[model samples]
Target: LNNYLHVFYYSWYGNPQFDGKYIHWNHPVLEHWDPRIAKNYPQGRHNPPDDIGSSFYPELGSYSSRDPSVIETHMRQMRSASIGVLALSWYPPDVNDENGEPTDNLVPTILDKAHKYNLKVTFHIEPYSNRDDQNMYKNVKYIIDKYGNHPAFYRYKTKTGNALPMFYVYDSYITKPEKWANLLTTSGSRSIRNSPYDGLFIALLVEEKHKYDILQSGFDGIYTYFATNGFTYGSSHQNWASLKLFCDKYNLIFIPSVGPGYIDTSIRPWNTQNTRNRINGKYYEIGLSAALQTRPSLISITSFNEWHEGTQIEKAVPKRTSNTVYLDYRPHKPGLYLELTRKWSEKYSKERATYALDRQLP
Candidate 1:
């Protein structure tokens, strides 16, 4: 199995330049929302430098995710960062987040482009309306039937030596534990065990209590998705060591998510308390250190381009809208995060190699 530094990636952004429409950038303001945001960004499109949709401004400006050039650039960026896998945000056909249109059609393109860079792509299944165990089974089958043969489709090699597709079920807690158990457990009536859809499933761990539920549901692993420090037990770096111990006892994988920082004041101005300062990349270093301490086989980054939450490591440049100023990587280059990621990834690879060598000698 390939050790992964998986970064969560979104292919939902759109701009008129390529997509012929504004998808997520033109978010609608609530009826009784903050008047200030409404006054600044009445159209809701994140204008760079100021009146931006995100806490940080993208160097690419408001670009379309569907553009081939964009995808190629992203692939090159990830490869340069030494990221092994991309956990792509996906939803079923005709189903999408209220923020953007459906992006299922882009998976093939992503796979092809990622393959060029030797980067793997795994599905991060988003919650759709009426998502259940049965539909999840169908979804898995659909994925395998559609893109399983692709070289870039990520597969995890289990302890038993079977290489199976890996999936990250985002907001998995939305489904009842029994429902998940029915599909994941070997003894369940609707079990996918030994079936074509059978694969390693990682459930999102929010609260500490969710660990027991995840074990009961028979998930292969648990992942922390949130970037905020105190927002959830799993996102809190301090708790990763204990979580890793629990996973070890249960023979499960623990994927701890790290992020450069957190800020969504552009969309939620009142939620400034959760904003984490980068402190010239110290925050991210702390997160990487903590996750490494847990000795996880896989470390998931909160995002590659989730610019809304300000967790993205994608390139961002200095910009100033007449009204507001966007945050940028000053005193350093825009590729600061990417360089840091590359440095840590090499360190991680060396450590894993050393451990493997030690095991072989013994």
Candidate 2:
């Protein structure tokens, strides 16, 4: 179970250096038009060394997600941090959020690259426009048909002795539980039960009410996705133990999402109230300790590199934009978060092992 430390990953970045196009260069919300963000950096794609376009600059600087070398390096970093899986945020073909272009084509490359480093990839299904059960059935079939055979595709072992593909449904609460039940519940009219595409599905729990709804919808698990501590009941560390107890009563997997920090002020400058301080890593350590106390079977890191939100554990370097200085892992090496992750990962393994032994005893 300790080996299931999954990190949320983004593959939407593009650059002239590799993809022959700038996908998110002129970000609709974060670019020159936005008075707050524009005042700090120049317009257009951020160039390396001096002009990178993130609230927190990466150590690799202005890299294209499609670049093979970047992917390989990312895999190496994850492996060193004891991350066994990458929960890649994904959308259906030809569909994407306003921030970037369609990135469905990148999955094959991500899977191939991750496999080389002994890491697995699972889908974090983002909510697209007009998403519903009928379309979701088709989407599930499409994913399983195209990539289920890949060695790096992640599978979850169910209590019933089946190893099935796992999918994390982001913003699942936006759609009514009845809509989800149609596809997820065995007794529903449009059920995917016993179908080749049948798999374990996890729903995002943003509120206390969402837990019962998730259970009723036939979801096998629930995950708290936000990195901000008090932004929601599900993301608050103080509430995880109770949530875990609820999941235990219902045989549901509870995956708590933790992050080093959060600060999207570079783009959403007005939203500073939600920003979390890393306190040099104490914040992350506290979150990890709280999560472990719950004894969950899975724990997810909020991000590897969602730079806009400043929650990434990926290496970042001290950088200065024209009007502002970007955040970095300072007073310590760039690899501080990765090293912290490794330290806690070993502790989790030992604790889990002891629990397993206790369960085996009379």
Candidate 3:
């Protein structure tokens, strides 16, 4: 039996040519999100402050770190390790910098390199923030128009003619349920109020926000935030047991997110007002085991590199470990978390693969 796997690598930043357009696709992991309100914001050198009070020193912003070449190198290594498709998350064209100019120099490079190595590219749409219709048609419609047919596009099947590439709608619940449901219907009026600037494919992540209702609202399938909370199945979970039941009832592909663990005590150190804001959290493998025990078609690991929040599965140089400055203060060393994932992925993949192979043999 063959086991299918998909890995997502992400990066974001601003361009200098087109008013420093903030292109989040240049690499994985947000270098920093601009705080000022403006268009064509030049990619600033200052790392987006992780809030006011923190022990860690601010990241010295550098164009070198945002390079897609570095990301490609990582991908090349990953491809060498396993056989699976690589998904790249992207946001629509927008100038997040003071200078408005096209700054997607890294995209074509990555794609070209990926093709050379037979790596599949899946574009995960970035959620729109301000609801700009022009941006949507340009970024979404344009990208789909030009690259939809690309051989590298990650599809349900191997080829475009016979397959639909995985296009996730980031933050699907942003749009109301009935309205989203209408989108799939004949001619439903799609109204997005205060929607994002670059509205692209909807990846459902908000289970607690009535996503199942929204699934009934109008989405092909869903990707959940099982990492945020342990992969426990119940009514109280983000993608709880009720969500699973809903997916099963409608025949929707439920993609659960699995993460090593969570700890965000650093950023919101004093906000102990509620349980939701706690960052020094841990993901129970038992919970993940239970969720995946049902055997879903696809399961996504929480993240490969969420340095800000410290949810990455990869190790970092200089060995970023348990430091008060690390996001949330949930430190276990760099490779510590990644090693855990490797152990699980290997074990799970092997077990599943063996079971599948056994079933196929006479």
Candidate 4:
């Protein structure tokens, strides 16, 4: 299990009991560009523990991401699911999304906990506005110098027998390829390749053109991050085979991220059309099956606990409040997704060994 499978993880949730106030649990309704489009939606935050901003209610209830106990519970859950690495959603210190607080301080605890369960941790760098090559160079050095020596810090072993660190650049396409090439390419001024901070940098693939541009950006690979298939060219199953082929041709590692389902109506009330039902886990199986068909070097799960979007494989239970009824795994156990992931991860490893699916370059 400690091999090809990886899951996107978020440790941004906070509640009054643990952090002095509610953080993400009380997420306000996201507004739309045109006022008319959001006219019917509620414009306030969801009350936690019972009317939280999630389509599915968590078994752990509203909790703080910074709480040691809560993080320990999460680690146990992931361990139960047999996940290998956690692509922790990360931002630089003092910077954060509007709904969440700065969580860089949580990395040390997360890494320590991950080491306890035979798990590894990798950085999933969120796109901040000041994301030019120089800014990235400084941050990358900070991350490696700070956490590089930890036993839980994930490193990818290459065919030539070098264990190098890996970082996933989320929404990498937002920055121009030339900008990334400056830090990634050998000839560029800010290049980190073969340097002490060198690592496998993977780009998030969204549009069709991103594939070509990612190649030009000097990235080591591409990964589709969105849980919604077809919402982007990279997320669509129809495009995976070709994308894998393209990666094979260019010697790039192609990773296809799968999800149990998607539903963000609690936060983005106006976006009801994007919900993808779990169908009692059939949706997830289909996704995993298709990803395996491509024989990818790596497979990423859209999330482990992204509750706002309901793409989590984390345990959830049936719950209800005065005005809202939370979704749950009916006619099934809460660990259904985790068990499914375990099954798939076992299958993936077996198939991987059978066909030599791993594409680690020498």
Global lDDT of each candidate:
0.85, 0.86, 0.47, 0.89
At residue 28, candidate 2 shows an lDDT of 37
Instruction: Evaluate model 4: give its TM-score.
Output: 0.97
lDDT by residue (tens digit), candidate 1, 1-362 = 23578999999988877777776765553222666655654344454223546867787777789999999999988898999899999999878997788899889999999998898999999988888999998999999889999999998755566688989999898888899989999998799899878899999999999988999888999999888888899999889999999998998889999999999777765667899998888999999888887778889998899988899999988887667677888878889999999988888776666544346664
lDDT (Cα, tens digit) per residue for candidate 3, span 1-362: 11244555554433344225333213222122444522233232223322222222223222222455555655655454353555566655653222123334445665666676677766666565653333443565566566666766555652223455466666665666665544433344542222221222334655355655655655556666434553233222444456666677876766666554543333333322322322322353543475556565565655554433434454543313343233332454434444454455565566555444346766
Question: What is candidate 4's local distance difference test score?
Answer: 0.89
Off by over 4 Å in 2: 30-53, 158-160
RMSD of each: 2.7, 3.0, 8.4, 2.3
Q: What TM-score do all the candidates reach, one by one?
A: 0.93, 0.92, 0.64, 0.97
Q: Is 1 or 3 the stronger prediction by lDDT? A: 1
Q: Among all windows of ten consecutive residues in candidate 2, which has the lowest summed lDDT?
A: 42-51
Order of candidate numbers by lDDT, starting with the best: 4, 2, 1, 3
Better of 1 and 3 by TM-score: 1
Using TM-score, give the best candidate's number: 4
Worst 10 residues of 1 by lDDT: 41-50
Worst 10 contiguous positions by lDDT, candidate 3: 49-58
Clashing pairs in 1: 46-53, 49-319, 49-321
Per-residue CA lDDT of model 4 for 1-362, tens digit only, reads: 64679999999998888888888889898988899888877888888767788999888888888888888888887777778899999999999977888999889999999899888999999987678789999999999999999999999976785688888999898889899999999988899988999999999999897888998899999999888877889988889999999999999999999999999999898777778999999999999999999999899999999999999998899987778888999989999998999898888988787665474545
Candidate 4: give the clashing pairs. Answer: none
The candidate that achieves the highest lDDT relative to the unseen native structure: 4
